[PDB]
Amino acid sequence: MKTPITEAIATADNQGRFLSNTELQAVNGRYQRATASLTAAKALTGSAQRLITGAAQAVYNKFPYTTQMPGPAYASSAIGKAKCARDIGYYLRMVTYCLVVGGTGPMDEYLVAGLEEINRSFDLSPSWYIEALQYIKNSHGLSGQVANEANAYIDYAINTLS
Amino acid sequence: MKTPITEAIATADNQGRFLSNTELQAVNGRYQRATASLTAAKALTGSAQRLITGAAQAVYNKFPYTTQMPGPAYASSAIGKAKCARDIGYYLRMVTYCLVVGGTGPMDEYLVAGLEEINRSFDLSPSWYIEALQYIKNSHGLSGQVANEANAYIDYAINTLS
Amino acid sequence: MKSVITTVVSAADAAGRFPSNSDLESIQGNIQRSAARLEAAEKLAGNHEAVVKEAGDACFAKYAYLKNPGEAGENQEKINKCYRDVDHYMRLVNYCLVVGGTGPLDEWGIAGAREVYRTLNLPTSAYVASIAYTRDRLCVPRDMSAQAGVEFSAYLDYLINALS
Amino acid sequence: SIVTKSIVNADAEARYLSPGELDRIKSFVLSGQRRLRIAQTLTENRERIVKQGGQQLFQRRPDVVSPGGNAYGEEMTATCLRDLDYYLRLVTYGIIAGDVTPIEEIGLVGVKEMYSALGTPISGVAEGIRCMKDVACSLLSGEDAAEVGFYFDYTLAAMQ
Amino acid sequence: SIVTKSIVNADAEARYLSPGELDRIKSFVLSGQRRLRIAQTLTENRERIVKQGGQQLFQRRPDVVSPGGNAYGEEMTATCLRDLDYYLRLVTYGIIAGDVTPIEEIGLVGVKEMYSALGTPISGVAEGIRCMKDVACSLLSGEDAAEVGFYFDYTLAAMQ
Amino acid sequence: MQDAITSVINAADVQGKYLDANSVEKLRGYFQTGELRVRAAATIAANAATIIKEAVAKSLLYSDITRPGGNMYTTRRYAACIRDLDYYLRYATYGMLAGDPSILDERVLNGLKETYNSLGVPIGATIQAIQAMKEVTGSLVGSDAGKEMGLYFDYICSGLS
Amino acid sequence: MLDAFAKVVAQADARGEFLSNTQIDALSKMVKEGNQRLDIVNKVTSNASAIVTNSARALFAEQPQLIQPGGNAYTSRRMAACLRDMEIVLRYVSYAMIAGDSSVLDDRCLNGLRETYQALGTPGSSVAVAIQKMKDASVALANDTTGTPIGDCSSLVAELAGYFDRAAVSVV
Amino acid sequence: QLAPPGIPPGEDARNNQSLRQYVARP
Amino acid sequence: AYDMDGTGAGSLEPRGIKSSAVEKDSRCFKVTFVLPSQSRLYTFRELQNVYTTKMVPFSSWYAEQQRIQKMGGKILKVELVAGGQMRSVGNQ
Amino acid sequence: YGFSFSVLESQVKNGQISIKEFVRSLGKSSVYQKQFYQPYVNSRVVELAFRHFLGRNLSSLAEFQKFFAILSKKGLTGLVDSLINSREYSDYFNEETV
Ligand SMILES: C=CC1=C(C)[C@@H](Cc2[nH]c(/C=C3N=C(/C=C4\NC(=O)[C@H](C)[C@H]4CC)C(C)=C\3CCC(=O)O)c(CCC(=O)O)c2C)NC1=O
Ligand SMILES: C=CC1=C(C)[C@@H](Cc2[nH]c(/C=C3N=C(/C=C4\NC(=O)[C@H](C)[C@H]4CC)C(C)=C\3CCC(=O)O)c(CCC(=O)O)c2C)NC1=O
Ligand SMILES: C=CC1=C(C)[C@@H](Cc2[nH]c(/C=C3N=C(/C=C4\NC(=O)[C@H](C)[C@H]4CC)C(C)=C\3CCC(=O)O)c(CCC(=O)O)c2C)NC1=O
Ligand SMILES: C=CC1=C(C)[C@@H](Cc2[nH]c(/C=C3N=C(/C=C4\NC(=O)[C@H](C)[C@H]4CC)C(C)=C\3CCC(=O)O)c(CCC(=O)O)c2C)NC1=O
Ligand SMILES: C=CC1=C(C)[C@@H](Cc2[nH]c(/C=C3N=C(/C=C4\NC(=O)[C@H](C)[C@H]4CC)C(C)=C\3CCC(=O)O)c(CCC(=O)O)c2C)NC1=O
Ligand SMILES: CCC1=C(C)/C(=C/C2=NC(=C\c3[nH]c(/C=C4\NC(=O)[C@H](C)[C@H]4CC)c(C)c3CCC(=O)O)/C(CCC(=O)O)=C2C)NC1=O
Ligand SMILES: CCC1=C(C)/C(=C/C2=NC(=C\c3[nH]c(/C=C4\NC(=O)[C@H](C)[C@H]4CC)c(C)c3CCC(=O)O)/C(CCC(=O)O)=C2C)NC1=O
Ligand SMILES: CCC1=C(C)/C(=C/C2=NC(=C\c3[nH]c(/C=C4\NC(=O)[C@H](C)[C@H]4CC)c(C)c3CCC(=O)O)/C(CCC(=O)O)=C2C)NC1=O
Ligand SMILES: CCC1=C(C)/C(=C/C2=NC(=C\c3[nH]c(/C=C4\NC(=O)[C@H](C)[C@H]4CC)c(C)c3CCC(=O)O)/C(CCC(=O)O)=C2C)NC1=O
Ligand SMILES: CCC1=C(C)/C(=C/C2=NC(=C\c3[nH]c(/C=C4\NC(=O)[C@H](C)[C@H]4CC)c(C)c3CCC(=O)O)/C(CCC(=O)O)=C2C)NC1=O
Ligand SMILES: CCC1=C(C)/C(=C/C2=NC(=C\c3[nH]c(/C=C4\NC(=O)[C@H](C)[C@H]4CC)c(C)c3CCC(=O)O)/C(CCC(=O)O)=C2C)NC1=O
Ligand SMILES: CCC1=C(C)/C(=C/C2=NC(=C\c3[nH]c(/C=C4\NC(=O)[C@H](C)[C@H]4CC)c(C)c3CCC(=O)O)/C(CCC(=O)O)=C2C)NC1=O
Ligand SMILES: CCC1=C(C)/C(=C/C2=NC(=C\c3[nH]c(/C=C4\NC(=O)[C@H](C)[C@H]4CC)c(C)c3CCC(=O)O)/C(CCC(=O)O)=C2C)NC1=O
């Protein structure tokens, strides 16, 4: 779990020493930034079903073959359209977890680690999820440093898929 | 390079001993299978352009969005079409190298080491190259143990892509 | 029935000896070779109506003159008998693979065939156009195994060598 | 299902269920996990199993779609594929019920009276289900294709 | 067996065997390796399964062996255990046949007429088979004891 | 005459739709209890006569329906009872396996209370016999299996009332 | 790790005995099987990706509670570790098929695998379902002709089923 | 099952050990 | 089920024909007999042939053979066409 | 409904079995018990048997209890065989008249 709190503890514990001001300053920067981070976590949560149902539609309009091809990997039946919107709500739920914790720690273990073995095995294309994450970036409707904290964890997910 | 000859040398040189009959039989079996493999490589070479033009067209039929979507990754323009018939000829040439050598060595050193890193970076889909390889497995026209040797290295590349 | 048994019990019976070790050894060859030649007896049996269909029309594609009046394949009934005869020659080859020798061919199809094909004015070259088409339609590891294609072809062109 | 007619069998005979009947209700319910996976494959492949099903049906029976055929025009051809969607649905019921009892009393009992009374060639609709069978068994492994194909050919048998 | 009455069922109905019938003949023959092991356990345990079977039978029903009981004396008590050796044998047949069809037409059909006509208390012989069941299921694991005990209690049901 | 699978297929078929996640969700719930129902139906088949002997002796054995004038006096009338109670313990076993009480009203409940009124059979003593028979059935098959077998007994008692 | 030929020699050396003539003929017919054994190993490794990803897809359809939030195979890393274990077991079973002996399979794949899954909390009865789904997916792929000559492979496919059953009881 | 832990299966040293000098495996 | 459940005298279902037929028996006879009606002269129904030869099952031959003599019939010949003899299992 | 008993129309049209045999086998069929046995009660099954295998209704109360106890103990195969094997069947229909 990459938190700013736990990266400070692991830095002091690599050399067997107490928490100095090198570490208390690192966890000070979590608390100054936590005001803008915790307001983005409520705004992305409160408009989640608008963003999940909107971004699932954004993939079908860019990739129309995913609703036409036969196979278990595509969203042509109702089973595949339900497993598509499940994944978009997995990506949105990880982003709000990172804004709550402070660092890119929840989506490292729960989302990114092991992901490209899954997309290669189950024949899922990572360009579908980039297009869905591009929709949430342009449509959360936030502004200021609330938007900059949210756009950073969205862009962190886009770089892992690309 | 992985070869029945060089893997016998490397397993005796690791132990630090002379080539016994454990190693003289592993290269005897390479010489028995070499007649089937060299007829399979002479036939795949002489019908390469038929297999290259056909396998690229077999990908544009299954995935017609690859000749439609704009961007650098897709075979929409004449430049992206030329970089696709070059990719099929790379996958086919490594199969005829593996038949000549006698193992999955030339396509390890030249094609499949680093393959998942250059696909994810340049945003290529491994499902495009599987359908290009299922065509060659169904259209080389070989028979018997000549086709058993050719389809063994085609099926090896499909396992790394998937 | 000229076979591997009926040469070692026809030569021993004319000699008046028991089956010695020279004749038990000959039927040991009837266990190793018969693993392959029954496979060509089984693939030919399960696909016989498509082989003769693919072979019997090559008699008429090569020689198109048979459907002229006065010739051999002139009407409906004589065309069906011409496809019947290639089914016969494909049946005795299935009988010869399961016997072990050329027994059912040398007694039942070959012997007397040069006297009926001259009397009934059948062209015997039209028969070997159908059998030699079947020998060259044979893909060796696709139709059957490698060895079963040797056994099936060696009775086929023996039948060609009988008719020509 | 196997549960309901193993009961009504032993029901009529004035007896309970034997080990032969209760070791198969037992054997069927442990099979139930694998049955739902098989029916789940055919459930959201009806777009490809029906449309490719009517693919080979018209290539093998152009009379039924040609002018004068029963399924001629934009109208009847839509209903021409509607029945295949029906029978593909009943096969999903038979796979989950472990028997053709759902297919029996739906789409099989008195089917010749309907199609004879509709002017439809009953042999033609039998050809349609066979074309769906090759598409269905091509979507599953060998262990499954011995089941999914197994219910189609029963429907083929009763439909002629 | 399950093979013979799954046939005569589909025989009477003028039809072949469904997947529900043929996926169980299939499921039964793969079960055949495990059935012979179970019957092999009871085969050379008849010395203990019968003798301890009549152990609890007399402790639970001393009337039948007391003077006046049907199995009184050295003679009847030997035949008293002979019937238990019979019914223990038929359970080995039912386990291998996968059904009580061997136990049905041997030792069950008209059994009340025999034992009523012999003066034997039919409830007493039912108590004997139950005592054998606890000895038999004590010789096998839980997965097997749900079968070997399963055929005894059917014999208990039909024997009253 | 529908089991749990037949009822699930009927409702999913009657709307013309496939077996969605909710229809298969109940079917998976039925297959989970498939192991429990057979063992429940196993022991009930073994102790059929013992269960009925326990119920009548515990509910209506010595009451004055058993004595002269009561509804169960003559031996033909007494013998009809255990014949009659055998169906309730038997058909309840079928409902426990099928997981659906459709077989009960199809083959037991319809014309039943209208028949006992004709004969003059006391419905009050009948239900208490089935209630006592339900009580002993929970002894054999256990708690949850008794909950399953007991769920169809009171279904008979409810409709027979 | 010793193959089927060295298993006979290892038993004879502890007796101090030469191999008798009825033991050499039992080993000369293992050579005669030969090509049929390498055809089985070629068919289960050429399709080795398809055996795992189809049997996994058919395992969460029957048991959907594994991929719900709170299930043992819900995340990216826990799903990839599920497909990883199935490829390891399938790898070592094909090692025991080319050897003719299950020695390499339980030396370095099955020792402690049961106690590993108890420590992690992985349901070992559901892991055994996945081994059996890979068993018949590769048994059915062993006895199809598709480029092989026609013959009897029935004793070797029964041998391959025994390795999948040994791995499925050594896991729970 | 398998061999015990560490024992290479098939290379056991107690295969044809005499009983008079046999030592029980801990 | 079968006809030998325990029924005999003094039992609730009436004392009747009890056959020794197993569960779903598959043995059947080939019988031959004449059976004059002996009731047409006060009923005056139409006449039917009384000489019949038919396959009766083992499950109900005894009832039929017990009844054919009830009305004065004479049995000319019977055989067991289908089924075995002394067969413990397999009559089903 | 396109039903078919080809085996029974075989064995009756040749005369291998009587009409009474063909009628009894029809009664023990499964297309019958699915029609007139499963949806009804053993009480109602007894009366529906008389309309079919005897062409008349029940006559008395004791004629019920004799035939209900038979169906009570042997089911459909025990009831229809007890009607076809009665004397009242034979007086009206023996082996040839439907
Ligand atoms: C050219 C001469 C020639 C022969 C003489 C036989 C020799 C012969 N017999 C058997 C082999 C055998 N022979 C028997 C026969 C018997 N065993 C008995 O206990 C009975 C007394 C008797 C039966 C009649 C059996 C049971 C086997 C082993 C099973 C078998 O191989 O069929 C084998 C196979 C095993 C081996 O390698 O030895 C051979 C080659 N075959 C030949 O090709
Ligand atoms: C028992 C004996 C037996 C055989 C000998 C074959 C013979 C045979 N092969 C084909 C049919 C075929 N045979 C081949 C094979 C080949 N085509 C060539 O030109 C190459 C020489 C060779 C490659 C190995 C192909 C590719 C077809 C299908 C297309 C065609 O007819 O050529 C047909 C027509 C019916 C069919 O489609 O199968 C027949 C009779 N089948 C048998 O049952
Ligand atoms: C035991 C093996 C066996 C055979 C090999 C055949 C051989 C054979 N063929 C024919 C008889 C015939 N065979 C042919 C055949 C042919 N004429 C043609 O147009 C083609 C050239 C050719 C077929 C490709 C015809 C047309 C007849 C009928 C001759 C006639 O009616 O005049 C007859 C005369 C009796 C008859 O069948 O009518 C016989 C013995 N029959 C056998 O029983
Ligand atoms: C190095 C690569 C390599 C392989 C992958 C194997 C594969 C292989 N198998 C066989 C040879 C064979 N292969 C089989 C196998 C089968 N037949 C069936 O019907 C079953 C489907 C299947 C069982 C798995 C049989 C039965 C033979 C014997 C040939 C025959 O008798 O026809 C041969 C040819 C031997 C010959 O004919 O001379 C080869 C090359 N061997 C190798 O050297
Ligand atoms: C001087 C006297 C003397 C002996 C009697 C033996 C006694 C003996 N037997 C075994 C060893 C054994 N003994 C048996 C015995 C049997 N197998 C069965 O299935 C039946 C129960 C029975 C055959 C009749 C078995 C299977 C083993 C092997 C145990 C194992 O490896 O797990 C061992 C362990 C060492 C070994 O692996 O051999 C010893 C000391 N050794 C001696 O030195
Ligand atoms: C919490 C972290 C997490 C992620 C990211 C995750 C992804 C994930 N998505 C999957 C499947 C899927 N994903 C999709 C989604 C799509 N296909 C399309 O065509 C659409 C365009 C797209 C929707 C955007 C489909 C259709 C499947 C089913 C594929 C199959 O079962 O073969 C699977 C395969 C196993 C399963 O069915 O559950 C995984 C593991 N699982 C996780 O636990
Ligand atoms: C010898 C081993 C070897 C392999 C395997 C290899 C693959 C390879 N393919 C590439 C590009 C490419 N590959 C494709 C191919 C396709 N896109 C489509 O639309 C089609 C569906 C499909 C072909 C059928 C295209 C269009 C590009 C250009 C992508 C780009 O320039 O961004 C690139 C990017 C570098 C470049 O521009 O050349 C590499 C490294 N190179 C190698 O040296
Ligand atoms: C679930 C079991 C079940 C079936 C099968 C079923 C069939 C059914 N098929 C119908 C019509 C039809 N069905 C066809 C079918 C065909 N034409 C062809 O050429 C082909 C051979 C064949 C299809 C493969 C046509 C053309 C009509 C319309 C006939 C008309 O308009 O006169 C209709 C009348 C319109 C309607 O209500 O749909 C019914 C009820 N109903 C059921 O409940
Ligand atoms: C395979 C099915 C089968 C059975 C069960 C069977 C029973 C059978 N039990 C018999 C006797 C007997 N059976 C008993 C039995 C008992 N006494 C008791 O107290 C106990 C309650 C009970 C035993 C547990 C006695 C005492 C006799 C001798 C009765 C006499 O001598 O009058 C006899 C007569 C003597 C004989 O031929 O053995 C038969 C045929 N035959 C069969 O074919
Ligand atoms: C399968 C569904 C089903 C049921 C339940 C059923 C009941 C039924 N119960 C009957 C009688 C009877 N039932 C009883 C029962 C009782 N007396 C009591 O005091 C108790 C409260 C009760 C026992 C629990 C008695 C005594 C008779 C005989 C009545 C008489 O002779 O007048 C009769 C009259 C005919 C006969 O028994 O042969 C029927 C038809 N029939 C069916 O088809
Ligand atoms: C000797 C060769 C060898 C094997 C085979 C092996 C297995 C092994 N499997 C593991 C985990 C695992 N194994 C599974 C597998 C499953 N869970 C399920 O729900 C499914 C039923 C099943 C397969 C589909 C899962 C989900 C984990 C991750 C457990 C966790 O991270 O909490 C782990 C824990 C470490 C890790 O995360 O990688 C080891 C060490 N280790 C070895 O050294
Ligand atoms: C009223 C005049 C009359 C008689 C006598 C009669 C006999 C008769 N005895 C029968 C069987 C039988 N009869 C016996 C008798 C015996 N086994 C022996 O070892 C003894 C020697 C003998 C006892 C004394 C047996 C064992 C069967 C059953 C045969 C079988 O299942 O194959 C059957 C076959 C059907 C059935 O029992 O349900 C009939 C019809 N029917 C009649 O209408
Ligand atoms: C289950 C065992 C069994 C068999 C086999 C059987 C046969 C049987 N075949 C019959 C007739 C027949 N069977 C045939 C058969 C043939 N004509 C030919 O040329 C061919 C050689 C042959 C067809 C292979 C014909 C034409 C009739 C009608 C005879 C007539 O109307 O006179 C009849 C007369 C009644 C009827 O068909 O309804 C019976 C009972 N019954 C059985 O219970």
Side-chain angles (χ1 to χ4, degrees), chain C residues 56 59-60 66 71-74 77-79 81-86 88-89 91-92 108-109 116-117 120 122-123 126-127 130:
Chain C
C59 190
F60 290 90
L66 308 165
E71 312 290 325
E74 45 181 356
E77 176 270 352
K78 275 166 142 80
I79 278 176
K81 293 190 118 195
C82 180
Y83 277 77
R84 202 263 323 265
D85 288 18
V86 196
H88 271 324
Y89 283 135
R91 209 156 47 87
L92 306 181
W108 293 359
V116 299
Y117 293 157
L120 303 186
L122 303 182
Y127 273 97
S130 43

Side-chain angles (χ1 to χ4, degrees), chain B residues 88-153:
Chain B
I88 310 306
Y90 287 168
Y91 273 83
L92 180 54
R93 219 174 66 210
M94 293 326 137
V95 169
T96 80
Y97 288 164
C98 286
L99 292 151
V100 160
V101 169
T104 80
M107 83 187 317
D108 278 1
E109 313 277 317
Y110 306 147
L111 194 139
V112 308
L115 187 55
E116 72 190 58
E117 278 89 29
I118 72 169
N119 273 337
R120 201 201 55 245
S121 301
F122 284 97
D123 193 37
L124 310 159
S125 192
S127 51
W128 303 340
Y129 294 100
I130 288 174
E131 187 50 85
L133 277 162
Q134 306 268 36
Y135 180 86
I136 309 181
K137 197 156 67 194
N138 297 316
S139 298
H140 47 51
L142 308 181
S143 298
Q145 301 314 315
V146 169
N148 260 19
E149 274 287 281
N151 296 344
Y153 299 116

Side-chain angles (χ1 to χ4, degrees), chain F residues 55 58-60 123-134 157:
Chain F
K58 193 177 69 168
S59 80
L60 51 90
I123 312 287
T126 319
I127 304 195
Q128 294 187 14
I130 303 185
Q131 291 299 309
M133 183 187 307
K134 172 166 72 68
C157 306

Side-chain angles (χ1 to χ4, degrees), chain D residues 103-120:
Chain D
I103 317 179
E104 198 63 0
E105 29 207 285
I106 309 166
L108 283 193
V109 167
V111 61
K112 292 189 174 58
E113 282 61 5
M114 155 191 277
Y115 273 131
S116 88
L118 285 190
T120 312

Side-chain angles (χ1 to χ4, degrees), chain J residues 34-92:
Chain J
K34 179 50 143 45
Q35 283 288 316
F36 297 98
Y37 177 74
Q38 288 180 204
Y40 304 89
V41 181
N42 295 8
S43 297
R44 186 61 179 169
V45 174
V46 172
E47 312 162 10
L48 275 185
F50 271 78
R51 197 264 201 208
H52 304 151
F53 304 120
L54 284 189
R56 90 188 168 78
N57 199 265
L58 280 163
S59 199
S60 88
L61 172 57
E63 188 147 274
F64 187 86
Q65 302 169 347
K66 201 211 294 183
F67 285 103
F68 181 77
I70 290 182
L71 160 78
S72 83
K73 216 69 168 177
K74 316 165 194 315
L76 208 54
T77 188
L79 169 73
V80 311
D81 263 348
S82 158
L83 294 174
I84 301 316
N85 293 338
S86 177
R87 299 174 74 133
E88 168 156 0
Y89 193 92
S90 89
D91 291 331
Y92 291 82

Side-chain angles (χ1 to χ4, degrees), chain C residues 91-132:
Chain C
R91 209 156 47 87
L92 306 181
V93 165
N94 176 229
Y95 292 162
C96 278
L97 287 153
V98 74
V99 165
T102 70
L105 275 168
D106 306 326
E107 274 164 62
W108 293 359
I110 296 161
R114 310 190 296 116
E115 276 82 18
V116 299
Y117 293 157
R118 196 172 95 263
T119 310
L120 303 186
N121 270 308
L122 303 182
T124 176
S125 57
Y127 273 97
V128 307
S130 43
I131 312 295

Side-chain angles (χ1 to χ4, degrees), chain E residues 4-5 8 101-102 104-106 108-113, chain I residues 2 4-7 18 21-23 88-92:
Chain E
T4 181
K5 58 167 219 279
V8 80
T101 318
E104 198 63 0
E105 29 207 285
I106 309 166
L108 283 193
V109 167
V111 61
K112 292 189 174 58
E113 282 61 5
Chain I
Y2 62 96
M4 291 183 166
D5 306 78
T7 330
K18 259 176 63 176
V22 67
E23 163 83 11
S88 309
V89 195
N91 301 118
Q92 204 266 0

